[PDB]
């Protein structure tokens, strides 16, 4: 009785620790699987804001009247 009193944790303490750690890891696992699905559909469809390799920007484009109208 003294050993369980002064040297040990309660079964309810261990129990709620187990429930807390399992809720944490369930959220972690579903976020990881959701991550890889988002990533594969994003690289597939291309509409996502991640895999945008840079195209032209029109900071080097200026429309103005030329020296030949058949431009």
């Amino acid at each position: 009785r003294w050993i369980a009193r002064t040297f040990f944790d309660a079964p309810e303490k261990n129990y709620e620790r187990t429930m807390a750690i399992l809720q944490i890891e369930s959220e972690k696992a579903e976020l990881r699987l959701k991550e890889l699905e988002v990533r594969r559909l994003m690289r597939a469809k291309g509409d996502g804001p991640w895999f945008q390799y840079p195209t032209i920007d029109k900071a080097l484009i200026d429309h103005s009247p030329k020296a030949t109208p058949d431009n």
Partner: protein, 57 residues
């Protein structure tokens, strides 16, 4: 008459009134299909560590 136009009076960019107002897009073209979705808002803080194999905390 017909005064000789002095050098360099065939310069001096010119206004002139017309028939039509200026047309839209004589380039037989279309607009952009879909622009970039603005991803903004208050960004969420860290979400349960790295979500790597381990190294939370």
């Amino acid at each position: 008459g017909w005064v000789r136009p002095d050098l360099g009076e065939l310069s001096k960019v010119t206004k002139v009134k017309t028939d039509r107002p200026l047309p839209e897009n004589p380039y037989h073209s279309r607009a952009r299909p879909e622009p970039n979705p603005e991803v903004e808002g208050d960004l969420k803080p860290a979400r349960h560590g790295s979500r790597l194999f381990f190294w939370t905390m």
